[PDB]
Amino acid sequence: GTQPIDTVGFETPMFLAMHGNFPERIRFYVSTAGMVADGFAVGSPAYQFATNAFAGNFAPQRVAIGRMSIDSSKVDFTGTTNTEQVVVNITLNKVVKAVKINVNTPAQIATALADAVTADKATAVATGTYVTVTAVSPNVVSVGKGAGVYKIVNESSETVATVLPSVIAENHNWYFLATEARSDADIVAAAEFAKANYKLHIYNSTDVDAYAPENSAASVFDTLKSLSYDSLGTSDAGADVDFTEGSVIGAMAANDPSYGDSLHLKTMPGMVPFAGSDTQRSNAWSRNANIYRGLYGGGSYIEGKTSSGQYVDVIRFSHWVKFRMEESVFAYMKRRSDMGLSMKMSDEDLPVLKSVLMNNPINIGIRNGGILTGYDNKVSYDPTIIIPKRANIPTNDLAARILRDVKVELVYNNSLHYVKIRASVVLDRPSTNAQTP
């Protein structure tokens, strides 16, 4: 029973964070200041994602944040090295704090972090490589990144495959999908929900099996490849601490698919250039794990392919056409019914759908260049609309008051990615038919 989104929703991205800062299941913001007011700690996951999303060239106007019941955080130094003042930002019930640990080994740093016991409500529990922070029933705690080399991890009693059906029921006016959980089960559940609700799933992973040799691997990229979904995946080193899905979305949220524009070379502020070697790049390209290569002193995305090998822009264009046609038909049918002139099921009224559909969804694409037109061979690329006649409508469909088998056809006008040249240098230059072929 998927209800349709509208134009504003087509740009709104949703991030499924863990927190308890508001009672609702979802809220919308137009800047990080509102989230700060709601008690999100600077450097917290949702804050980072919102900053990245607003920091893009094609940034969206509003960002939606979901809620998943939080249980307890973690400040993990395991496997890290630190020779700098470690700092952690903590917000407690609208009270904002800062924590400082000087300089030494990660275990010593973690133990010394237990000093976060003053002016508190909340509790801190060191464990030799990480500190587990747990709040108390009435207290609310937000823990955010600072200057230290550490990653913040959250845990919850819920699961995505059960939280999402609540968020969508609460509100459905959003298109992109993202999550904080990074387990394979959570990622696959998100992909399966998104593919069923016609939403684009995005995710960043740091697993080295993306680099692993093509001969064999068992990474989430490979699982999605096998299942043949459309989730857009990318491999980044800093994903687990920066949630760069926001940066990815910020480079594609605002440009409409009517231009047929792709994602091949767009700069994404906040991302960190890929570091592996050319063999690793070749390996990754096989799994459809897009990378952010740094070239000629700048950063550039690479080829934006989905899990099943298809390009992202074709999928997005098809979805845009779907939503635009839905909206246009609803608008026209509602205007017709505002007057006492409702559209009847007769041959004197049915054809008008041709112009109604030509106007809003299709003609804009033909104008802007996303739809190919012209002549091929013995075929033409012009979009076509076919509508049935009253004689062909089944009596059961007449009784149910439903119209079926309205068909449309188009051609997509893809963009260019690669170029090859055959230059030649010579010290000099060397049949004369001169007859028209």
């Binding site: 026209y332 205007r335 017709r336 004197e348 009224d349 054809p351 008008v352 041709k354 112009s355």
Partner: protein, 141 residues
Amino acid sequence: LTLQAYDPAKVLVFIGGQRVSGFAADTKIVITRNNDNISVHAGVDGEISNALSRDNTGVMTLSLQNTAKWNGYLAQWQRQANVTGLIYLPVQVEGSQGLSLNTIGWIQKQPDLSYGTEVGQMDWEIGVLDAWLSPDQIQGI
């Protein structure tokens, strides 16, 4: 297999989304183009070269009885556009058996209104921004 007979009552005109009604007797509409398809340049010795026409506007006449309710709508649309600057509306035509048409267009000139002893007629001039006829409705093309 029964071949169609030309049904004058199934010739439809949709302007802006609605269907026009209230035509005068005889010709309901007339469609005419403005320019020739190809321009031929002929040399002194007989060499011939052709140029393709890139101006495809047309004109469609619309005969309505002066008591038709659709005169008011066109009069309102005409004056509205002269102020706002938005002049285009979708135009679509159908044929019982004939050549259809589906483009955008605008009201070009105000017809001539005359009053007498019998219900008269008004002939509107609707400009159409493309004038290519289509074989959609031909039974067998």
